[PDB]
Design a protein around this ligand. Structure first.
Ligand SMILES: [O-][n+]1cc(-c2c(-n3cnnn3)ccc(Cl)c2F)ccc1[C@@H](CC1CC1)n1cc(-c2cncs2)cn1
Length: 236
C-alpha cells in the first residue's frame, strides 16, 4: 500500500495473507474470508502455482513476522479460478480458495459480507484498501498490514485514464486524481472494503494498475457485485 498507515490487531479481521511454499515460503497475495471454508482472492495470484499443495492460508495476522514454523495455517483443498480468466488486465481476475477445514470465527478472523442484493445502486463513499504490499514501486513486502482510504472513480473516468485497455462493468476503479494512495506489488488479491450503514462489504478485489499511486492512474479492482452469482454457484 502506497501512502497508507499501519493497522492494529483485529482491525481488518477478514484479511488473510496467502503464502506459497515453493521454492521458499513467502507472502504471495492477499485474500478475504467470505465463509468458514472460503477465501476470495485474485486469479492472477496463481500464475506459476503448480497445485494447491504448496499454499498456506494464514488468518488473524497483523505482522508477517508473527508467522513461524509452529504458526497454525489452513491448507487449501481447491483453487477455483474463473473459467474466462486469461490475464488481470482483461478481467475475470477472481478466484475462490476452498479450505481443508472450517474457520472458527474469532475477534481476529471474521467474514466480510458480499455486496447485498438490492444494493446495486449504492454509492460507496467509505472504501479502504489493505495489504502487506510495497510502499512504492521498488520496495519490499511490509511487516505490518497497511491501510489506505481511497475514493471510487466512475468507469467513464477510469476508461479515459486507460485508453489502451477495455474497462468493463466487471471492473471498478479507485484513486485520487493527484495520486499518492494506491495498492502496489503484493497487495493483489486483497479486499477493497467499503462500509455502508455500518456494515462492511467486499466491493472489490485488488487486481492491477499502471505503476503505483501515479497521478491520474487509478487502481483497478474486480467488481465483486458482478460475480455474486458465480460465487454463490461455486460455494453452494
Ligand atoms: O500485488 N500486485 C499489485 C498490483 C497492482 C498495482 N501495481 C502495478 N505495478 N505494481 N503494482 C497497482 C494497482 C493495483 Cl490495484 C494493483 F493490484 C499488480 C500486481 C500485483 C502482484 C501480481 C502477482 C501476484 C501475481 N504482484 C506481487 C508482486 C510481489 C510479491 N512479492 C514481492 S513483489 C509483484 N506483483
Amino acid at each position: 500500500i502506497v501512502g497508507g498507515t499501519a493497522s492494529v490487531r483485529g482491525e481488518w479481521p477478514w484479511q488473510v495473507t496467502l503464502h506459497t511454499t515453493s521454492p521458499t515460503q513467502r507472502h504471495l497475495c492477499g485474500g478475504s474470508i467470505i465463509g468458514n471454508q472460503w477465501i476470495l482472492t485474485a486469479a492472477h495470484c496463481f500464475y506459476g502455482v503448480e497445485s494447491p499443495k504448496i499454499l498456506r492460508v494464514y488468518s488473524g495476522i497483523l505482522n508477517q513476522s508473527e508467522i513461524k514454523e509452529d504458526t497454525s495455517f489452513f491448507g487449501v483443498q481447491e483453487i477455483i479460478i474463473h473459467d474466462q480468466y486469461k490475464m488481470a488486465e482483461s478481467g475475470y481476475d477472481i478466484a475462490l480458495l476452498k479450505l481443508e477445514t472450517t474457520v472458527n470465527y474469532t475477534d481476529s478472523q471474521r467474514p466480510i459480507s458480499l455486496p447485498s442484493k438490492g444494493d446495486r445502486n449504492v454509492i460507496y463513499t467509505d472504501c479502504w484498501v489493505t495489504g502487506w504490499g510495497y510502499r512504492k514501486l521498488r520496495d519490499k513486502i511490509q511487516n505490518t498490514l497497511q491501510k489506505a482510504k481511497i475514493p471510487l472513480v466512475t468507469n467513464e473516468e477510469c476508461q479515459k485514464r486507460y485508453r489502451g485497455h477495455k474497462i468493463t462493468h466487471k471492473m471498478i476503479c479507485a484513486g485520487y486524481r493527484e495520486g499518492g494512495k494506491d495498492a502496489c506489488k503484493g497487495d493483489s488479491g486483497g479486499p477493497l472494503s467499503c462500509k455502508h450503514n455500518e456494515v462492511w462489504h467486499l466491493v472489490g478485489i485488488t487486481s492491477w494498475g499502471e505503476g503505483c499511486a501515479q497521478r491520474e492512474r487509478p487502481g483497478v479492482y474486480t467488481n465483486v457485485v458482478e460475480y455474486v452469482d458465480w460465487i454463490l454457484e461455486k460455494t453452494q
